[PDB]
């Protein structure tokens, strides 16, 4: 088949869905029992069975899909915060690069789903690897999703104006990236510099 601009936007949107589920699971944002094991990208992953969250993510993912297609979304951020104070403790950032020319493409692009799938699987393994060094979240936390766009006027009303919600004193490590040939997704996670080691 190959890669079209719409095919790519679906891949990426869907990646974010699985990416978010894995963060919320691995970081204990929702209890581990509100998650279920499924097969995706050739491995076993955890996705929510919480009905509100399912609905919420379906809505986000459908919107990202639309924005990615139009090259209207540059950053997707998962902000993890102390439920009491609102202090940001951990902040996962995805940067999205777009080939705006892919709209002019007369053929799907040559990259095997397998190839893309190997890339995504590598990125997800990496996300899993973070449990082994991320500072413990030692208070109860919630999450929030932010996006960054250049096209502000066409953002649906349901999306509220926001700050970037940076951590004051942070450490950040770069994760692997993947590419469809049309969208490239860079990842990283930042977190508050620990009190002591």
């Amino acid at each position: 088949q190959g890669i079209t601009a719409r095919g790519s936007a679906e891949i990426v949107a869907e990646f974010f869905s699985f990416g978010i589920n894995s963060i919320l699971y691995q970081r204990g944002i929702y209890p581990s029992e509100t998650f279920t094991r499924v097969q995706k990208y050739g491995l076993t992953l955890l996705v929510t069975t919480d009905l509100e969250l399912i609905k919420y993510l379906n809505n986000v993912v459908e919107q990202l899909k639309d924005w990615l297609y139009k090259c209207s979304v540059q950053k997707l951020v998962v902000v993890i915060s102390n439920i009491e104070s609102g202090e940001v403790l951990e902040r996962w950032q995805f940067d999205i690069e777009c080939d705006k020319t892919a709209k002019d493409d007369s053929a799907p692009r040559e990259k095997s789903q397998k190839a893309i799938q190997d890339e995504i699987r590598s990125v997800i393994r990496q996300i899993t690897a973070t449990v082994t060094f991320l500072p413990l979240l030692e208070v109860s936390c919630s999450f929030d999703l932010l996006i960054y766009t250049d096209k502000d006027l066409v953002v649906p009303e349901k999306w509220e104006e926001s700050g970037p919600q940076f951590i004051t004193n942070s450490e950040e490590v770069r994760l692997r990236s993947f590419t469809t040939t049309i969208h490239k997704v860079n990842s990283m996670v930042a977190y508050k510099i620990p009190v002591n080691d």
Binding site: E52, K55, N59, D144, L145, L146, Y148, K158, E160, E161
Partner: peptide
């Protein structure tokens, strides 16, 4: 700019 879409509130 930055925009936010808040997750369901929890009880």
């Amino acid at each position: 700019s930055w925009y936010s879409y808040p997750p369901p509130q929890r009880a």
